[PDB]
Amino acid sequence: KFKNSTYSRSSVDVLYTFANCSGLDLIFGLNALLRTADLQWNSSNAQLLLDYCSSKGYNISWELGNEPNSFLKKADIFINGSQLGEDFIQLHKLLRKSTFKNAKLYGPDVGQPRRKTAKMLKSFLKAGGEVIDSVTWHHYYLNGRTATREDFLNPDVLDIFISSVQKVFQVVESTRPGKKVWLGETSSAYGGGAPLLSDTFAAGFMWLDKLGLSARMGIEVVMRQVFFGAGNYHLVDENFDPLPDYWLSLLFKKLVGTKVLMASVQGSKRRKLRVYLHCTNTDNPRYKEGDLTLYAINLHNVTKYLRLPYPFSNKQVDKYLLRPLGPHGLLSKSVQLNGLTLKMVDDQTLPPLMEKPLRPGSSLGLPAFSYSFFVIRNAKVAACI
Amino acid sequence: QDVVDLDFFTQEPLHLVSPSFLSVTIDANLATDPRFLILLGSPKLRTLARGLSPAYLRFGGTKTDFLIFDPKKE
Ligand SMILES: O=C(O)[C@H]1O[C@@H](O)[C@H](O)[C@@H](O)[C@@H]1O[C@H]1O[C@H](COS(=O)(=O)O)[C@@H](O[C@@H]2O[C@H](C(=O)O)[C@@H](O[C@H]3O[C@H](CO)[C@@H](O)[C@H](O)[C@H]3NS(=O)(=O)O)[C@H](O)[C@H]2O)[C@H](O)[C@H]1NS(=O)(=O)O
Ligand SMILES: *[C@@H]1O[C@H](CO)[C@@H](O)[C@H](O)[C@H]1NC(C)=O
Ligand SMILES: *[C@@H]1O[C@H](CO)[C@@H](O)[C@H](O)[C@H]1NC(C)=O
Ligand SMILES: *[C@@H]1O[C@H](CO)[C@@H](O)[C@H](O)[C@H]1NC(C)=O
Ligand SMILES: [Cl-]
């Protein structure tokens, strides 16, 4: 199934210029299965790529290997985490001797922390943990081939993510205390996504919850599989149309700040009503220092009404409620923000993201199977200023 | 009753996420698509990408370990 393939200077150029023109920071995964006589990493192809990227003044960050935990299954080669650690030390020497000597290095891009994966991540961080800037690991909830509609709406499925995060931090804290932890590749379902699920309004429950738990639990960066590509889990289809998860991502980018706080529901039945609280993004021109962004998921089959605690009860709140455009309900590929369909104005213009001012003191309405952001204006939270 | 009281902790940040907290990938697989240049050239796609700035764009996936740089290829 897995044949060796080549790529050109042209390909590199396409990739870098996409990122540069888009204002994104490229991380490039290097081939870890290029092996010397005694299963040492052969850095000679990476040397060719590093030289060329240097010769063009490309500022790139690096990874080495994808899911090394399954190299045996993929290529009948087993590389233990100690050897992989030594391989990263060798790549780090090459970066230091390069034109970009401060270039960042991330790894080891392991799968979710099963016992054999946890063992490999521990031996990797013992041996090579000194040279990585962040620990990367991967998470998918489901097999795209078998995933059901009910799975995408199931708090019991959402909650499995929590123990995966706990096991990763248990390995990191026992080997490289305080090292930053990143989700280097993550989505709803593997095998390219669940057909008619991973590309719909229903995909939003898993995506917003994963962002809320990641921020709440200490994950610094979450990398969405994929922005664009063959798989159903794309934010943008091959006709360059944005799916509901693109719009959800854009609202999150505009409204949600870097400072993570906490919200919880009294009666403590944190299953189907899921709530997350950050400081408002200060890049948002509309809002000011001290403002709060609440986001909420309602997996109940009825509307829930949320009451804000003192001293926020009577603040002006801006609602950003996402609902599917019919007739396909949760399986729709179109979303409305406060009743207006989200659609590009033209190929060069994203639309405004129009808030709905609620009357102060009112309870926050969250319809069945929906998610919403709520900005609490003039919150005056000192933690946020 | 479908009314639900929220409790908030607001006395200090519990964590700081990157300004790039919501990042994205492009799968290594896409660089085997004959139309790679046309696809990532799309100015529509770059408009959509720029909306998620600032962010990392991670290029990687299973094919990461099956891709070889060739300085001769066109
Ligand atoms: O989504 C995953 O599974 C990701 O898993 C992580 O572990 C990897 O890091 C990441 O790279 C994976 O995503 C990418 O690779 C997936 C696995 O590809 S593989 O070749 O099986 O190894 C890939 O998912 C596959 O996509 C295939 C495709 O051709 O698009 C699917 O192929 C089926 O469908 C086509 C027609 O639609 C048919 O012509 C194929 O022969 C048929 N094969 S079938 O499986 O027997 O049905 C295949 O179902 C699926 O497993 C991801 O698409 C890819 N990510 S990307 O963004 O789409 O590039
Ligand atoms: C590494 O790879 C190159 C290029 O494929 C090869 O010619 C060289 O002999 C290899 N080096 C070792 C030490 O195996
Ligand atoms: C890891 O792999 C290397 C290379 O195959 C081997 O020499 C070494 O003994 C292995 N380490 C452990 C701890 O098993
Ligand atoms: C919600 O789910 C319950 C439990 O199965 C069901 O019996 C009830 O009638 C549903 N209500 C609505 C409004 O769909
Ligand atoms: Cl911010």
PDB file of N, CA, C and O in Angstrom, chain A residues 109-177:
ATOM      1  N   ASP A 109       5.475  12.975  17.220  1.00  0.00           N
ATOM      2  CA  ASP A 109       4.259  12.777  16.384  1.00  0.00           C
ATOM      3  C   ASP A 109       3.742  11.334  16.560  1.00  0.00           C
ATOM      4  O   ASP A 109       3.242  10.760  15.582  1.00  0.00           O
ATOM      5  N   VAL A 110       3.766  10.813  17.789  1.00  0.00           N
ATOM      6  CA  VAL A 110       3.156   9.492  18.142  1.00  0.00           C
ATOM      7  C   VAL A 110       1.621   9.562  18.100  1.00  0.00           C
ATOM      8  O   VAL A 110       1.025  10.652  18.264  1.00  0.00           O
ATOM      9  N   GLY A 111       1.018   8.391  17.929  1.00  0.00           N
ATOM     10  CA  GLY A 111      -0.423   8.178  18.088  1.00  0.00           C
ATOM     11  C   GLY A 111      -0.855   8.380  19.527  1.00  0.00           C
ATOM     12  O   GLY A 111      -0.052   8.717  20.404  1.00  0.00           O
ATOM     13  N   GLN A 112      -2.129   8.195  19.765  1.00  0.00           N
ATOM     14  CA  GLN A 112      -2.724   8.352  21.107  1.00  0.00           C
ATOM     15  C   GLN A 112      -2.108   7.304  22.042  1.00  0.00           C
ATOM     16  O   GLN A 112      -1.636   6.243  21.620  1.00  0.00           O
ATOM     17  N   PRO A 113      -1.982   7.636  23.340  1.00  0.00           N
ATOM     18  CA  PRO A 113      -1.067   6.919  24.224  1.00  0.00           C
ATOM     19  C   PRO A 113      -1.568   5.585  24.782  1.00  0.00           C
ATOM     20  O   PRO A 113      -1.559   5.423  25.965  1.00  0.00           O
ATOM     21  N   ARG A 114      -1.844   4.628  23.902  1.00  0.00           N
ATOM     22  CA  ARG A 114      -1.764   3.165  24.177  1.00  0.00           C
ATOM     23  C   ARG A 114      -0.453   2.816  24.908  1.00  0.00           C
ATOM     24  O   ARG A 114       0.533   3.570  24.795  1.00  0.00           O
ATOM     25  N   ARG A 115      -0.418   1.667  25.584  1.00  0.00           N
ATOM     26  CA  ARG A 115       0.746   1.213  26.386  1.00  0.00           C
ATOM     27  C   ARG A 115       2.026   1.224  25.538  1.00  0.00           C
ATOM     28  O   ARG A 115       3.018   1.799  26.005  1.00  0.00           O
ATOM     29  N   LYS A 116       2.031   0.610  24.358  1.00  0.00           N
ATOM     30  CA  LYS A 116       3.276   0.503  23.546  1.00  0.00           C
ATOM     31  C   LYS A 116       3.651   1.895  23.025  1.00  0.00           C
ATOM     32  O   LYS A 116       4.851   2.197  22.989  1.00  0.00           O
ATOM     33  N   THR A 117       2.667   2.732  22.682  1.00  0.00           N
ATOM     34  CA  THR A 117       2.917   4.143  22.289  1.00  0.00           C
ATOM     35  C   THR A 117       3.463   4.958  23.470  1.00  0.00           C
ATOM     36  O   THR A 117       4.405   5.767  23.228  1.00  0.00           O
ATOM     37  N   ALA A 118       2.909   4.790  24.680  1.00  0.00           N
ATOM     38  CA  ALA A 118       3.371   5.505  25.901  1.00  0.00           C
ATOM     39  C   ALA A 118       4.832   5.138  26.223  1.00  0.00           C
ATOM     40  O   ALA A 118       5.615   6.048  26.607  1.00  0.00           O
ATOM     41  N   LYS A 119       5.191   3.865  26.068  1.00  0.00           N
ATOM     42  CA  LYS A 119       6.575   3.354  26.282  1.00  0.00           C
ATOM     43  C   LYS A 119       7.533   4.043  25.297  1.00  0.00           C
ATOM     44  O   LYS A 119       8.571   4.557  25.725  1.00  0.00           O
ATOM     45  N   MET A 120       7.197   4.044  24.014  1.00  0.00           N
ATOM     46  CA  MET A 120       7.989   4.727  22.958  1.00  0.00           C
ATOM     47  C   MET A 120       8.101   6.235  23.223  1.00  0.00           C
ATOM     48  O   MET A 120       9.205   6.799  23.002  1.00  0.00           O
ATOM     49  N   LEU A 121       7.010   6.918  23.604  1.00  0.00           N
ATOM     50  CA  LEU A 121       7.103   8.369  23.916  1.00  0.00           C
ATOM     51  C   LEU A 121       8.029   8.607  25.124  1.00  0.00           C
ATOM     52  O   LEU A 121       8.825   9.551  25.081  1.00  0.00           O
ATOM     53  N   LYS A 122       7.943   7.791  26.171  1.00  0.00           N
ATOM     54  CA  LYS A 122       8.803   7.922  27.385  1.00  0.00           C
ATOM     55  C   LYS A 122      10.282   7.745  26.987  1.00  0.00           C
ATOM     56  O   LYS A 122      11.098   8.628  27.343  1.00  0.00           O
ATOM     57  N   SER A 123      10.624   6.681  26.251  1.00  0.00           N
ATOM     58  CA  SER A 123      12.039   6.386  25.893  1.00  0.00           C
ATOM     59  C   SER A 123      12.531   7.466  24.935  1.00  0.00           C
ATOM     60  O   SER A 123      13.690   7.888  25.075  1.00  0.00           O
ATOM     61  N   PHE A 124      11.663   7.955  24.038  1.00  0.00           N
ATOM     62  CA  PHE A 124      11.978   9.086  23.151  1.00  0.00           C
ATOM     63  C   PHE A 124      12.311  10.342  23.972  1.00  0.00           C
ATOM     64  O   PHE A 124      13.322  11.037  23.653  1.00  0.00           O
ATOM     65  N   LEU A 125      11.464  10.723  24.936  1.00  0.00           N
ATOM     66  CA  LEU A 125      11.691  12.001  25.661  1.00  0.00           C
ATOM     67  C   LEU A 125      12.936  11.855  26.569  1.00  0.00           C
ATOM     68  O   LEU A 125      13.668  12.840  26.706  1.00  0.00           O
ATOM     69  N   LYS A 126      13.188  10.683  27.150  1.00  0.00           N
ATOM     70  CA  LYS A 126      14.438  10.430  27.928  1.00  0.00           C
ATOM     71  C   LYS A 126      15.669  10.718  27.047  1.00  0.00           C
ATOM     72  O   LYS A 126      16.529  11.514  27.491  1.00  0.00           O
ATOM     73  N   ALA A 127      15.706  10.178  25.823  1.00  0.00           N
ATOM     74  CA  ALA A 127      16.892  10.178  24.929  1.00  0.00           C
ATOM     75  C   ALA A 127      17.006  11.504  24.160  1.00  0.00           C
ATOM     76  O   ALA A 127      18.102  12.083  24.156  1.00  0.00           O
ATOM     77  N   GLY A 128      15.921  11.986  23.549  1.00  0.00           N
ATOM     78  CA  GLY A 128      15.944  13.131  22.615  1.00  0.00           C
ATOM     79  C   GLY A 128      15.146  14.343  23.082  1.00  0.00           C
ATOM     80  O   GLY A 128      15.080  15.310  22.328  1.00  0.00           O
ATOM     81  N   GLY A 129      14.572  14.328  24.285  1.00  0.00           N
ATOM     82  CA  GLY A 129      13.622  15.367  24.739  1.00  0.00           C
ATOM     83  C   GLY A 129      14.260  16.738  24.877  1.00  0.00           C
ATOM     84  O   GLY A 129      13.528  17.743  24.871  1.00  0.00           O
ATOM     85  N   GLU A 130      15.587  16.791  24.996  1.00  0.00           N
ATOM     86  CA  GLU A 130      16.332  18.046  25.247  1.00  0.00           C
ATOM     87  C   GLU A 130      16.278  18.946  24.009  1.00  0.00           C
ATOM     88  O   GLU A 130      16.369  20.187  24.172  1.00  0.00           O
ATOM     89  N   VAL A 131      16.168  18.372  22.811  1.00  0.00           N
ATOM     90  CA  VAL A 131      16.310  19.157  21.545  1.00  0.00           C
ATOM     91  C   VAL A 131      14.947  19.524  20.934  1.00  0.00           C
ATOM     92  O   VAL A 131      14.943  20.339  19.995  1.00  0.00           O
ATOM     93  N   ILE A 132      13.826  19.013  21.442  1.00  0.00           N
ATOM     94  CA  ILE A 132      12.488  19.379  20.883  1.00  0.00           C
ATOM     95  C   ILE A 132      11.925  20.585  21.652  1.00  0.00           C
ATOM     96  O   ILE A 132      12.156  20.703  22.855  1.00  0.00           O
ATOM     97  N   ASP A 133      11.239  21.463  20.942  1.00  0.00           N
ATOM     98  CA  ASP A 133      10.636  22.701  21.485  1.00  0.00           C
ATOM     99  C   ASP A 133       9.228  22.391  21.996  1.00  0.00           C
ATOM    100  O   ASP A 133       8.777  23.084  22.927  1.00  0.00           O
ATOM    101  N   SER A 134       8.593  21.358  21.446  1.00  0.00           N
ATOM    102  CA  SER A 134       7.257  20.875  21.874  1.00  0.00           C
ATOM    103  C   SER A 134       7.113  19.395  21.550  1.00  0.00           C
ATOM    104  O   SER A 134       7.667  18.947  20.544  1.00  0.00           O
ATOM    105  N   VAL A 135       6.384  18.698  22.407  1.00  0.00           N
ATOM    106  CA  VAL A 135       6.026  17.272  22.259  1.00  0.00           C
ATOM    107  C   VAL A 135       4.760  17.242  21.406  1.00  0.00           C
ATOM    108  O   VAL A 135       3.766  17.912  21.796  1.00  0.00           O
ATOM    109  N   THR A 136       4.768  16.492  20.307  1.00  0.00           N
ATOM    110  CA  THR A 136       3.578  16.343  19.420  1.00  0.00           C
ATOM    111  C   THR A 136       3.017  14.929  19.546  1.00  0.00           C
ATOM    112  O   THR A 136       3.788  13.934  19.563  1.00  0.00           O
ATOM    113  N   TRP A 137       1.701  14.836  19.620  1.00  0.00           N
ATOM    114  CA  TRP A 137       1.009  13.532  19.575  1.00  0.00           C
ATOM    115  C   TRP A 137      -0.278  13.734  18.784  1.00  0.00           C
ATOM    116  O   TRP A 137      -0.666  14.914  18.511  1.00  0.00           O
ATOM    117  N   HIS A 138      -0.905  12.636  18.407  1.00  0.00           N
ATOM    118  CA  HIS A 138      -2.050  12.624  17.470  1.00  0.00           C
ATOM    119  C   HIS A 138      -3.262  12.013  18.154  1.00  0.00           C
ATOM    120  O   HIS A 138      -3.103  11.130  18.977  1.00  0.00           O
ATOM    121  N   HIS A 139      -4.445  12.467  17.783  1.00  0.00           N
ATOM    122  CA  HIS A 139      -5.712  11.942  18.325  1.00  0.00           C
ATOM    123  C   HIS A 139      -6.819  11.956  17.265  1.00  0.00           C
ATOM    124  O   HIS A 139      -7.090  13.014  16.669  1.00  0.00           O
ATOM    125  N   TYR A 140      -7.494  10.823  17.139  1.00  0.00           N
ATOM    126  CA  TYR A 140      -8.765  10.655  16.413  1.00  0.00           C
ATOM    127  C   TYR A 140      -9.722   9.928  17.356  1.00  0.00           C
ATOM    128  O   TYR A 140      -9.243   9.037  18.101  1.00  0.00           O
ATOM    129  N   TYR A 141     -11.009  10.291  17.379  1.00  0.00           N
ATOM    130  CA  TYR A 141     -11.976   9.615  18.271  1.00  0.00           C
ATOM    131  C   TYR A 141     -12.321   8.234  17.722  1.00  0.00           C
ATOM    132  O   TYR A 141     -12.420   7.298  18.540  1.00  0.00           O
ATOM    133  N   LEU A 142     -12.529   8.134  16.402  1.00  0.00           N
ATOM    134  CA  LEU A 142     -13.233   7.004  15.725  1.00  0.00           C
ATOM    135  C   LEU A 142     -12.532   6.617  14.421  1.00  0.00           C
ATOM    136  O   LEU A 142     -11.789   7.424  13.853  1.00  0.00           O
ATOM    137  N   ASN A 143     -12.804   5.390  13.993  1.00  0.00           N
ATOM    138  CA  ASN A 143     -12.610   4.890  12.616  1.00  0.00           C
ATOM    139  C   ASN A 143     -13.709   5.466  11.717  1.00  0.00           C
ATOM    140  O   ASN A 143     -14.902   5.181  11.935  1.00  0.00           O
ATOM    141  N   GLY A 144     -13.316   6.265  10.724  1.00  0.00           N
ATOM    142  CA  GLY A 144     -14.237   6.881   9.743  1.00  0.00           C
ATOM    143  C   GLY A 144     -15.114   5.847   9.073  1.00  0.00           C
ATOM    144  O   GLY A 144     -16.264   6.158   8.755  1.00  0.00           O
ATOM    145  N   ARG A 145     -14.611   4.631   8.886  1.00  0.00           N
ATOM    146  CA  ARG A 145     -15.363   3.577   8.173  1.00  0.00           C
ATOM    147  C   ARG A 145     -16.610   3.181   8.964  1.00  0.00           C
ATOM    148  O   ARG A 145     -17.634   2.927   8.299  1.00  0.00           O
ATOM    149  N   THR A 146     -16.558   3.155  10.305  1.00  0.00           N
ATOM    150  CA  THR A 146     -17.641   2.581  11.153  1.00  0.00           C
ATOM    151  C   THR A 146     -18.356   3.676  11.948  1.00  0.00           C
ATOM    152  O   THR A 146     -19.401   3.386  12.579  1.00  0.00           O
ATOM    153  N   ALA A 147     -17.859   4.901  11.930  1.00  0.00           N
ATOM    154  CA  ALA A 147     -18.386   5.923  12.853  1.00  0.00           C
ATOM    155  C   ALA A 147     -19.846   6.171  12.487  1.00  0.00           C
ATOM    156  O   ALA A 147     -20.148   6.160  11.300  1.00  0.00           O
ATOM    157  N   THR A 148     -20.712   6.325  13.484  1.00  0.00           N
ATOM    158  CA  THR A 148     -22.154   6.614  13.310  1.00  0.00           C
ATOM    159  C   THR A 148     -22.447   8.061  13.673  1.00  0.00           C
ATOM    160  O   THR A 148     -21.644   8.700  14.384  1.00  0.00           O
ATOM    161  N   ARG A 149     -23.607   8.530  13.226  1.00  0.00           N
ATOM    162  CA  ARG A 149     -24.171   9.839  13.614  1.00  0.00           C
ATOM    163  C   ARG A 149     -24.195   9.953  15.141  1.00  0.00           C
ATOM    164  O   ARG A 149     -23.799  11.018  15.653  1.00  0.00           O
ATOM    165  N   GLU A 150     -24.635   8.891  15.829  1.00  0.00           N
ATOM    166  CA  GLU A 150     -24.853   8.913  17.296  1.00  0.00           C
ATOM    167  C   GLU A 150     -23.513   9.109  17.996  1.00  0.00           C
ATOM    168  O   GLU A 150     -23.510   9.723  19.040  1.00  0.00           O
ATOM    169  N   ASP A 151     -22.429   8.555  17.453  1.00  0.00           N
ATOM    170  CA  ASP A 151     -21.058   8.676  18.006  1.00  0.00           C
ATOM    171  C   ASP A 151     -20.670  10.153  18.064  1.00  0.00           C
ATOM    172  O   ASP A 151     -20.140  10.594  19.102  1.00  0.00           O
ATOM    173  N   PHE A 152     -20.883  10.866  16.955  1.00  0.00           N
ATOM    174  CA  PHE A 152     -20.554  12.308  16.797  1.00  0.00           C
ATOM    175  C   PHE A 152     -21.334  13.144  17.825  1.00  0.00           C
ATOM    176  O   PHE A 152     -20.858  14.256  18.129  1.00  0.00           O
ATOM    177  N   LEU A 153     -22.447  12.643  18.367  1.00  0.00           N
ATOM    178  CA  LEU A 153     -23.284  13.405  19.347  1.00  0.00           C
ATOM    179  C   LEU A 153     -23.138  12.866  20.771  1.00  0.00           C
ATOM    180  O   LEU A 153     -23.905  13.334  21.690  1.00  0.00           O
ATOM    181  N   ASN A 154     -22.231  11.918  20.987  1.00  0.00           N
ATOM    182  CA  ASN A 154     -22.220  11.110  22.236  1.00  0.00           C
ATOM    183  C   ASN A 154     -21.182  11.639  23.233  1.00  0.00           C
ATOM    184  O   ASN A 154     -19.978  11.453  23.017  1.00  0.00           O
ATOM    185  N   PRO A 155     -21.603  12.229  24.387  1.00  0.00           N
ATOM    186  CA  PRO A 155     -20.671  12.680  25.414  1.00  0.00           C
ATOM    187  C   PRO A 155     -19.706  11.576  25.845  1.00  0.00           C
ATOM    188  O   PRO A 155     -18.610  11.884  26.202  1.00  0.00           O
ATOM    189  N   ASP A 156     -20.134  10.324  25.824  1.00  0.00           N
ATOM    190  CA  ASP A 156     -19.266   9.198  26.241  1.00  0.00           C
ATOM    191  C   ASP A 156     -18.101   9.088  25.254  1.00  0.00           C
ATOM    192  O   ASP A 156     -17.036   8.717  25.670  1.00  0.00           O
ATOM    193  N   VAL A 157     -18.306   9.425  23.997  1.00  0.00           N
ATOM    194  CA  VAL A 157     -17.235   9.413  22.960  1.00  0.00           C
ATOM    195  C   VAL A 157     -16.384  10.665  23.159  1.00  0.00           C
ATOM    196  O   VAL A 157     -15.169  10.552  23.167  1.00  0.00           O
ATOM    197  N   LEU A 158     -17.005  11.827  23.367  1.00  0.00           N
ATOM    198  CA  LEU A 158     -16.263  13.092  23.590  1.00  0.00           C
ATOM    199  C   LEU A 158     -15.302  12.917  24.775  1.00  0.00           C
ATOM    200  O   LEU A 158     -14.121  13.298  24.639  1.00  0.00           O
ATOM    201  N   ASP A 159     -15.758  12.292  25.875  1.00  0.00           N
ATOM    202  CA  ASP A 159     -14.990  12.202  27.147  1.00  0.00           C
ATOM    203  C   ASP A 159     -13.747  11.305  27.013  1.00  0.00           C
ATOM    204  O   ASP A 159     -12.833  11.470  27.861  1.00  0.00           O
ATOM    205  N   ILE A 160     -13.641  10.425  26.009  1.00  0.00           N
ATOM    206  CA  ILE A 160     -12.431   9.547  25.893  1.00  0.00           C
ATOM    207  C   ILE A 160     -11.200  10.429  25.690  1.00  0.00           C
ATOM    208  O   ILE A 160     -10.119  10.074  26.164  1.00  0.00           O
ATOM    209  N   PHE A 161     -11.352  11.571  25.033  1.00  0.00           N
ATOM    210  CA  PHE A 161     -10.231  12.494  24.747  1.00  0.00           C
ATOM    211  C   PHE A 161      -9.538  12.855  26.066  1.00  0.00           C
ATOM    212  O   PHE A 161      -8.308  12.925  26.064  1.00  0.00           O
ATOM    213  N   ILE A 162     -10.312  13.078  27.130  1.00  0.00           N
ATOM    214  CA  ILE A 162      -9.797  13.513  28.460  1.00  0.00           C
ATOM    215  C   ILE A 162      -8.723  12.536  28.934  1.00  0.00           C
ATOM    216  O   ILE A 162      -7.609  13.014  29.275  1.00  0.00           O
ATOM    217  N   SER A 163      -8.977  11.227  28.947  1.00  0.00           N
ATOM    218  CA  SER A 163      -7.969  10.275  29.480  1.00  0.00           C
ATOM    219  C   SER A 163      -6.741  10.195  28.553  1.00  0.00           C
ATOM    220  O   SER A 163      -5.633   9.996  29.069  1.00  0.00           O
ATOM    221  N   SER A 164      -6.891  10.355  27.243  1.00  0.00           N
ATOM    222  CA  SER A 164      -5.724  10.397  26.319  1.00  0.00           C
ATOM    223  C   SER A 164      -4.838  11.572  26.735  1.00  0.00           C
ATOM    224  O   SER A 164      -3.636  11.384  26.899  1.00  0.00           O
ATOM    225  N   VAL A 165      -5.420  12.744  26.982  1.00  0.00           N
ATOM    226  CA  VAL A 165      -4.644  13.959  27.378  1.00  0.00           C
ATOM    227  C   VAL A 165      -3.926  13.645  28.716  1.00  0.00           C
ATOM    228  O   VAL A 165      -2.725  13.983  28.803  1.00  0.00           O
ATOM    229  N   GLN A 166      -4.617  13.022  29.693  1.00  0.00           N
ATOM    230  CA  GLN A 166      -4.069  12.710  31.046  1.00  0.00           C
ATOM    231  C   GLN A 166      -2.861  11.783  30.880  1.00  0.00           C
ATOM    232  O   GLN A 166      -1.838  12.082  31.501  1.00  0.00           O
ATOM    233  N   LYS A 167      -2.932  10.749  30.052  1.00  0.00           N
ATOM    234  CA  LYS A 167      -1.803   9.802  29.868  1.00  0.00           C
ATOM    235  C   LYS A 167      -0.621  10.519  29.211  1.00  0.00           C
ATOM    236  O   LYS A 167       0.499  10.305  29.647  1.00  0.00           O
ATOM    237  N   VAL A 168      -0.844  11.404  28.237  1.00  0.00           N
ATOM    238  CA  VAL A 168       0.287  12.141  27.610  1.00  0.00           C
ATOM    239  C   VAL A 168       1.032  12.956  28.676  1.00  0.00           C
ATOM    240  O   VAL A 168       2.269  12.867  28.692  1.00  0.00           O
ATOM    241  N   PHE A 169       0.323  13.763  29.484  1.00  0.00           N
ATOM    242  CA  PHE A 169       0.930  14.616  30.537  1.00  0.00           C
ATOM    243  C   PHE A 169       1.596  13.747  31.606  1.00  0.00           C
ATOM    244  O   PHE A 169       2.623  14.189  32.123  1.00  0.00           O
ATOM    245  N   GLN A 170       1.076  12.558  31.911  1.00  0.00           N
ATOM    246  CA  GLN A 170       1.757  11.621  32.843  1.00  0.00           C
ATOM    247  C   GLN A 170       3.120  11.190  32.275  1.00  0.00           C
ATOM    248  O   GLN A 170       4.072  11.167  33.072  1.00  0.00           O
ATOM    249  N   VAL A 171       3.259  10.943  30.968  1.00  0.00           N
ATOM    250  CA  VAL A 171       4.580  10.550  30.386  1.00  0.00           C
ATOM    251  C   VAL A 171       5.515  11.767  30.379  1.00  0.00           C
ATOM    252  O   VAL A 171       6.617  11.673  30.950  1.00  0.00           O
ATOM    253  N   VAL A 172       5.047  12.906  29.878  1.00  0.00           N
ATOM    254  CA  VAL A 172       5.849  14.152  29.811  1.00  0.00           C
ATOM    255  C   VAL A 172       6.312  14.539  31.233  1.00  0.00           C
ATOM    256  O   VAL A 172       7.524  14.781  31.391  1.00  0.00           O
ATOM    257  N   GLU A 173       5.439  14.552  32.248  1.00  0.00           N
ATOM    258  CA  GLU A 173       5.793  15.071  33.600  1.00  0.00           C
ATOM    259  C   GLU A 173       6.811  14.144  34.271  1.00  0.00           C
ATOM    260  O   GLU A 173       7.541  14.613  35.146  1.00  0.00           O
ATOM    261  N   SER A 174       6.898  12.888  33.858  1.00  0.00           N
ATOM    262  CA  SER A 174       7.826  11.889  34.430  1.00  0.00           C
ATOM    263  C   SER A 174       9.183  11.937  33.716  1.00  0.00           C
ATOM    264  O   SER A 174      10.062  11.199  34.176  1.00  0.00           O
ATOM    265  N   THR A 175       9.362  12.738  32.647  1.00  0.00           N
ATOM    266  CA  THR A 175      10.610  12.724  31.815  1.00  0.00           C
ATOM    267  C   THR A 175      11.110  14.137  31.471  1.00  0.00           C
ATOM    268  O   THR A 175      12.323  14.354  31.642  1.00  0.00           O
ATOM    269  N   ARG A 176      10.247  15.061  31.024  1.00  0.00           N
ATOM    270  CA  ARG A 176      10.605  16.465  30.655  1.00  0.00           C
ATOM    271  C   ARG A 176       9.594  17.430  31.261  1.00  0.00           C
ATOM    272  O   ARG A 176       8.845  18.116  30.567  1.00  0.00           O
ATOM    273  N   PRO A 177       9.563  17.540  32.603  1.00  0.00           N
ATOM    274  CA  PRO A 177       8.586  18.392  33.267  1.00  0.00           C
ATOM    275  C   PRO A 177       8.528  19.772  32.613  1.00  0.00           C
ATOM    276  O   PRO A 177       9.564  20.348  32.448  1.00  0.00           O
TER     277      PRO A 177
END
